[PDB]
Amino acid sequence: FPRPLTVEELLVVTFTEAATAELRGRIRSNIHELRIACLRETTDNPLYERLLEEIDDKAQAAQWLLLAERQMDEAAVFTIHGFCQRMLNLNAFESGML
Amino acid sequence: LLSDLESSQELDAFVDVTPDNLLHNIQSDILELENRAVAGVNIEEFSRSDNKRPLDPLDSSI
Amino acid sequence: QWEPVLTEWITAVLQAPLNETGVSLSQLSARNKQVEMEFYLPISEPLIASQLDTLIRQFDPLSAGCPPLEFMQVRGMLKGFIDLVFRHEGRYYLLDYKSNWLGEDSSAYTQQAMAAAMQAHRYDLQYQLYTLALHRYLRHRIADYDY
Amino acid sequence: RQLAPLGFDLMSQKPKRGDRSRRDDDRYLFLEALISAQQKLYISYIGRSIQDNSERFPSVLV
Amino acid sequence: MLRVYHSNRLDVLEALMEFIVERERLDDPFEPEMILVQSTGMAQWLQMTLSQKFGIAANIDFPLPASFIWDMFVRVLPEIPKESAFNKQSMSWKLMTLLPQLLEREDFTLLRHYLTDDSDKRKLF
Numbered sequence: 080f081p082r083p084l085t086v087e088e089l090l091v092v093t094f095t096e097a098a099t100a101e102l103r104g105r106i107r108s109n110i111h112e113l114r115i116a117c118l119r120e121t122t123d124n125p126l127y128e129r130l131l132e133e134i135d136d137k138a139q140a141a142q143w144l145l146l147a148e149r150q151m152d153e154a155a156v157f158t159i160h161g162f163c164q165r166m167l168n169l170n171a172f173e174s175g176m177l
Numbered sequence: 178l179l180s181d182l183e184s185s186q187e188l189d190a191f192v193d194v195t196p197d198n199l200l201h202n203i204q205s206d207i208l209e210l211e212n213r214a215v216a217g218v219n220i221e222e223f224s225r226s227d228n229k230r231p232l233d234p235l236d237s238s239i
Numbered sequence: 240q241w242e243p244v245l246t247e248w249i250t251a252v253l254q255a256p257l258n259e260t261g262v263s264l265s266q267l268s269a270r271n272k273q274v275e276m277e278f279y280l281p282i283s284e285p286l287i288a289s290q291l292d293t294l295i296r297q298f299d300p301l302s303a304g305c306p307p308l309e310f311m312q313v314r315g316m317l318k319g320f321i322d323l324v325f326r327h328e329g330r331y332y333l334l335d336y337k338s339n340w341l342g343e344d345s346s347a348y349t350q351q352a353m354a355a356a357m358q359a360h361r362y363d364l365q366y367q368l369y370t371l372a373l374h375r376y377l378r379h380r381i382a383d384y385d386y
Numbered sequence: 387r388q389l390a391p392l393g394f395d396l397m398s399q400k401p402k403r404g405d406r407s408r409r410d411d412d413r414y415l416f417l418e419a420l421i422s423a424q425q426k427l428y429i430s431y432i433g434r435s436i437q438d439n440s441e442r443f444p445s446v447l448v
Numbered sequence: 449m450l451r452v453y454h455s456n457r458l459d460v461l462e463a464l465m466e467f468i469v470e471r472e473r474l475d476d477p478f479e480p481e482m483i484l485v486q487s488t489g490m491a492q493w494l495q496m497t498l499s500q501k502f503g504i505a506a507n508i509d510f511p512l513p514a515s516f517i518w519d520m521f522v523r524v525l526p527e528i529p530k531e532s533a534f535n536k537q538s539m540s541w542k543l544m545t546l547l548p549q550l551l552e553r554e555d556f557t558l559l560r561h562y563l564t565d566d567s568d569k570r571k572l573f
Contacts, residue, residue, distance in 0.1 A: 118216050185451070191454070204421055207420075279499040279506075280499065281500055316499065376504050
């Protein structure tokens with residue numbers, strides 16, 4: 080991607096509510112594992128190993144994952160019906176809704 | 178914003194929490210402003226777990 | 240329908256003299272006015288009914304009528320609302336407001352009848368607890384205070 | 387507790403020092419509750435939903 | 449002089465507040481003690497802790513920082529009304545007036561598309 084992004088700027092849409100809470104905790108755990116792997120510089124998993132190979136500066140990346148870990152509460156994973164509800168309530172005047 | 182006041186006179190009274198229970202261990206670390214988490218930066222630190230704080234199995238605090 | 244009958248009666252209340260000194264409510268300046276005091280009076284040991292009314296009835300003539308007060312053992316903080324507190328001639332006073340009395344108009348409010356209802360609604364203990372409050376507040380706030 | 391801004395509010399666009407948000411209020415409340423406990427701390431949450439027997443997750447603070 | 453008291457727990461600050469009132473007592477008896485609290489339960493805990501030591505707690509004002517400072521405005525500067533003309537309540541009815549008047553101002557035209565569709569006046573409120 081052209082620029083690094085913030086957790087609150089990533090939009091994930093899953094139709095089932097139970098899958099949105101599982102994917103939120105699944106991403107929350109994968110950010111925590113990769114953050115520790117960046118500080119340890121070594122990992123026992125192939126995916127995180129190939130990620131550490133592409134990582135240029137592991138120190139700044141670990142700080143980004145730490146800020147990404149603290150924002151997972153407002154991390155956006157919504158359903159189709161849970162999205163429009165939050166989006167139409169964000170900008171009211173364009174939608175013309177109470 | 179409190180430390181930005183020019184004419185303010187600041188004085189502190191802090192009761193030291195003697196760590197015993199797991200609860201008093203965390204309140205300590207937050208009070209003394211120290212990081213007790215072991216990240217395991219090197220394999221020598223990653224192996225021995227004795228460098229952490231001992232936890233009693235009978236502690237119901239946390 | 241009320242206001243013509245109200246603004247008059249209100250003037251009769253503010254102009255009425257009080258006690259011996261004949262203090263009129265209109266003579267009180269805002270400096271000496273304290274309205275709606277909320278006090279917290281802690282009770283340390285558990286308060287027993289029989290252990291209380293015996294002391295009450297002892298020194299208080301109004302506690303002779305009616306049976307002894309009946310309440311469960313209570314230990315904690317006591318709450319209350321003082322309607323008005325004011326000082327005049329360097330002497331503090333205690334004021335409370337009651338209305339009730341649906342059926343009576345004429346002299347049926349008298350020295351014997353008012354005290355008869357004070358014993359009926361158990362307002363005896365109320366001002367006795369209000370004075371203990373005010374005594375502790377005046378003792379705490381005023382340096383070198385005497386009852 | 388999630389309270390979203392009105393979306394046309396200018397304060398959320400350029401935050402300052404003394405700006406108050408409900409997210410930072412509840413996050414700081416969890417820290418106030420942690421230091422306030424002098425003996426025992428009790429934290430409970432639903433791990434598994436009793437209806438469909440699925441998996442839930444505790445708050446990020448916990 | 450403005451003094452800031454830092455402490456690990458509230459029980460030390462409450463005991464320090466007990467010492468400040470104990471060392472110096474107010475001349476006028478009826479002058480209330482100003483204590484700023486953001487909620488009711490915080491004020492009700494201070495009343496029970498102060499009454500537990502001194503023996504009673506009475507005449508303690510517990511306003512909000514917004515109401516306090518506003519009350520400080522009327523005392524320091526004359527001509528200020530005791531309650532302001534701009535509130536969360538009155539400004540809603542005042543805007544319910546101007547907003548139908550301010551439509552088609554060449555600025556509000558973005559807001560005009562939200563209202564002029566149709567309403568029972570609920571959208572305006």
